[PDB]
Design a protein around this ligand. Structure first.
Ligand SMILES: O=C(O)CCC(=O)C(=O)O
Ligand SMILES: O=C(O)CCC(=O)C(=O)O
Ligand SMILES: O=C(O)CCC(=O)C(=O)O
Ligand SMILES: O=C(O)CCC(=O)C(=O)O
Lengths: 84, 213, 215, 84, 216, 213, 85
DNA sequence: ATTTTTATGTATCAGCTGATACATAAAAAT
DNA sequence: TTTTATGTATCAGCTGATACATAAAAAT
DNA sequence: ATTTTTATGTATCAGCTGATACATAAAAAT
DNA sequence: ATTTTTATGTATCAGCTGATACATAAAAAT
């Protein structure tokens, strides 16, 4: 539920973190998705499509069950069911 | 110009043939192409999980669509349902061939921004139509657009040169097929329209437009 | 990104950023359409006015948006028909069509960056079509609120405050309704604890949640 | 959206057809899934878990595109979306 | 499946006869020696506690192929019952003794398997009810319970699922820890939400799944 | 006998150790095991995707759980969250070795069905508690079960020998932690309980039960 | 008010002593009763039901009356009263 | 500082319009 | 057949139209 | 067939209880 | 040892929901 203003596409919201690139998406029905790089250079962006972004959050869900906690599994679960 | 310029991006570029009712692109497809309608009509629609279709616009000849590809490239996935409402001819140039083609021809970039402009206004024109409250006023506004884009001159008025279902109309003006039928029948009693071979024909369009003072 | 940079170099040198104060009109119906604009900071309200005195908001544009798009079709020959007003304090560029004719053949780099801008417009206008194509005025309002939050929303303590002051009538003009109904529906959102009006600004809560409802 | 009364677990509802073996699921949160076949006797329920049931409806989606209509997929898409 | 078949062969000689019970008839009372194990074949069985204040609390409402009278398994005839097994509806069932069962278990290892299957089901169904009552929102709690009803006694209907059994507002209230009045109150609010309909004292849900989606 | 019979299903079978808060099984794990709690307490809970926890039962010593494995075998996947609420010792025999062990010992089959029976009743006892209307009555009913299963004899009453968070309690009674405290505070003013070292202590358990005639 | 932890049933509490043979009972609603044989490893939890359990406490009440202390007669009255009245 | 013009809250009822269901015509299937 | 589209009828409940009191904003 | 007991719909009002927010104590953390 | 994270006490609202009472419908009694 973290927000970020894209120059062209306006407001975005965070889907998940990775390691630390976080996944972000458009607010009206999430048609586009963005990989962000908070470098000293600043805010580096990298657009991705539904097909790739679906399986990518899917991978993170599998990663949290295997070697990770639950609170974060449960909340990302709601995020995934919200988007896809 | 648009017809002429798109002929030269690829070796020429072949006119793709698409049959009646065939889908052009589905939601989920990578947006890697820009399209140009040459002959016929194309319905762009949004589909919900409830199974509901909403017509975004019904595009006519020399129109540019598939415009998602110009923002991020093949990176983004489609979301609308592009279906040929009638038999259609079109061109289908890729984004990476277009990045080439724009720096190549500044005459084409002129030609393209022309087509894009037209789209904005035609889509904004539709906003005017839907922003009415009287569904009566809203329907006529929509009818006028159809006559503008697909109407052919006729003996007593203008026949909208394409077959249209009451649901297809209802999906475009935010209504049920029922209400479309009701209001059309009331215009037939007012004898402002006629249905000939399933085709809607307008009587004295201008008089209908003058009701939008 | 490049739009702000490219418009800088069509030069009256570059071209000066025009300042416009709040509520000031940029163009009216009847003006010769000989220019294209680029909004830099703030919001631009495009509206149609009827003889009855009624205003209908067509689109409410955001930063890095191209408008005044009539000028590219016939040129100076056509007269405008919408009412472009500065909805907030605004910065913009304003280059002519004849200076643009030169600018396009000059730079096919700008041609690329321009069609990118016009693309965005198509979608944003089409996005609005989705909103108004709803039946439920409740659903229709939230859909519209989501767009405002997308374009003008700023991060807030408990939610998203849409960073612009909006009148109930201005909302009603955009969603095809009366001020009354907007007020009533907003009140029902306050009881559902989904919004809050703090300093005359609408604030949604985890709008995300609101968007699911629009599967 | 077809229903069937399991002796032990009560009411069940159909997920998808295959060819004609159908997938069925439990009503309170689809907590489990059943492979049914209409032998003259039926009497042939084969239970399966979430992980297997997931990829099985998933294969059917692809299959539809590879070789089937849109809505049969349009419809089963609804189903997968609701259960998964 | 097998439970109905296996209980058939533990007979008075012979098979064992199917015992018939009419609507409202009690099967066992508090104070009876628990010496028998039952299996419901068709209809519904309501297990309840009765207080001195005259208050009834429904523990579980059992469906077909369910094993009950499970007290007899622990000590045998030695213990006395404390719940009120009444025949929620017209009911058919078997009634084998614990001493007949001791022999029947060493006799058939196949029945041993089929029995623990039935007991497992009971644990879950009772635990499922725990989920329902652990709600805070009485609205949420009631729908959760209604979902169970459908699951167990729901028959396919034109527009949804009609629970194929009659229900007393009090009977519902006793099961979900509420008063009759609220039950009526909440049901009327679901009628305005048009998620349910009562035709001929029979309740009927629509888009069941859709109701379940509200409990993510 | 349960502790004794489980010892011999292996060679012998090793007692698994688990520390406080450690999870035993998660939703998504194949149900292939049958468990027996030896020392301490086990919390079974349901997790919603909203992040909400609901306590199904708080199990005591010599209790059998992991009961799904008996229905299809390894075929089914769990859906509750088995967590060691306290420092815990357990046995954990597989279903396929149990199929052997039950036909091996008809003595343990008796001891096992004893265990399963107790579970049904204890779970049904909880149904009585939550079928209350008065949250005050509902809380005490639950407290009585706690005192029955975990309570130790004390100088002035019965101290429930385990530390419980209001939330844990609340999740179990399906209410707000505040309400938990709120009500507790009101029983402190009525001086029916005392909280010493974060442990609940009832004054005269019989007297509280007499309020449930 | 003496307690004993049954493996399966958990906490129990003593009803009456007897000559060995202390009657014990379950804690929640006292829904069962047990004859405990406190022998060296002679521990036995022989289960009995309410009907037998009732008359058995009742018998000890009469027994203390004829030739048995008042204090203990007074106390058993309490237990009987709580379990059965 | 006084005005006044414009925006907002509140309360009603009339009628178009969405939801549901059915008969019949047209068009696609077949 | 068989699917899909269309006309017709009848409802419940939003929602537009009308009118008024009061607050806020712009004008002055 | 007569009566009558039980079930249902509707209307009201008083208070517990969930939601929200804050200060402070207790426990984990490091 | 410090800090800081987690648990607890207090204070105040609004709105379910239990209590109370009545007329009428449906079911069991007769
Ligand atoms: O560009 C897309 O992929 C979808 C939208 C579209 O085709 C268009 O509006 O032109
Ligand atoms: O271009 C016009 O004349 C009206 C629409 C518009 O201004 C725009 O969208 O830019
Ligand atoms: O076990 C008993 O005798 C009473 C309750 C019951 O039969 C059961 O729930 O199985
Ligand atoms: O057995 C299961 O897998 C779930 C229920 C449970 O944990 C149990 O009672 O054993």
């Amino acid at each position: 539920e973290n927000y970020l203003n894209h120059p062209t596409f306006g407001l975005l919201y965070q889907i998940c973190s990775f390691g630390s690139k976080e996944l972000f998406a458009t607010l009206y029905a999430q048609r586009l998705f963005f990989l962000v790089a908070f470098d000293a250079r600043g805010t580096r962006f990298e657009p991705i499509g539904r097909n790739e972004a679906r399986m990518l959050v899917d991978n993170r869900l599998r990663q949290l069950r295997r070697d990770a906690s639950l609170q974060e599994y449960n909340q990302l679960q709601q995020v995934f069911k919200q988007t896809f | 110009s648009l017809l002429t310029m798109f002929r030269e991006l690829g070796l020429p570029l072949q006119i793709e043939q698409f049959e009646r009712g065939k889908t052009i692109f589905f939601p989920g497809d990578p947006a890697e192409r820009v399209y140009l309608l040459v002959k016929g009509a194309v319905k762009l629609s949004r589909v919900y999980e409830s199974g509901e279709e909403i017509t975004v616009a019904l595009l006519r000849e020399n129109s540019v669509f598939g415009v998602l590809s110009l923002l991020t490239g093949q990176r983004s996935d489609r979301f609308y349902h592009a279906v040929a409402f009638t038999p259609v001819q079109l061109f289908s140039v890729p984004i990476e061939f277009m990045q080439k083609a724009l720096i190549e021809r500044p005459e084409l970039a002129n030609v393209m921004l022309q087509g894009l402009s037209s789209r904005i206004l035609q889509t904004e024109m539709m906003i005017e139509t839907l922003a009415h409250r009287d569904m009566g006023s809203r329907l006529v506004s929509f009818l006028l657009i159809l006559c503008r884009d697909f109407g052919i001159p006729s003996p007593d008025g203008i026949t909208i040169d394409l077959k249209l279902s009451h649901q297809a109309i209802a999906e475009a003006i935010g209504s049920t097929r029922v209400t479309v039928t009701r209001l059309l029948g009331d215009l037939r009693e007012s004898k402002l329209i006629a249905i000939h071979k399933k085709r809607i024909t307008v009587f004295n369009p201008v008089a209908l437009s003058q009701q939008f003072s």
